[PDB]
């Protein structure tokens, strides 16, 4: 009628706002879970180009390796 749920709408809005913020953190957490599947990569410097798909690289910890190259790079 004249009043209806206009006055009661205040309680619903307050409850929804508090619960709405909780779901926001869930999106943030998912970002972390998307990083747990990314592993590290050894770091070394290129020494020479034997061929188009073969390189001589020495990891800056240990030995010298002959390794390939990613196509896109």
């Amino acid at each position: 009628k004249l009043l209806e749920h206009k006055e009661i709408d205040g309680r619903l809005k307050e409850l929804r706002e508090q619960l709405k913020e909780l779901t926001k953190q869930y999106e943030k957490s998912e970002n972390d879970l998307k990083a747990l599947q990314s592993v590290g990569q050894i770091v070394g410097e290129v020494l020479k180009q034997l061929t188009e798909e073969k390189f001589i690289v020495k990891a800056t910890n240990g030995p010298r390796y002959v390794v390939g190259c990613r196509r896109q790079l």
């Binding site: 749920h5 953190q25 869930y26």
Partner: protein, 31 residues
């Protein structure tokens, strides 16, 4: 009356929304 039915419908919707939201939003964080 005409607004009596509307009030009952709104109350029923609120109960479902509160239960449904917890079962989905809260579960994702805990999982």
């Amino acid at each position: 009356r005409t607004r009596l039915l509307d009030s009952e419908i709104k109350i029923m919707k609120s109960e479902v929304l509160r239960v449904t939201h917890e079962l989905q939003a809260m579960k994702d964080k805990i999982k």
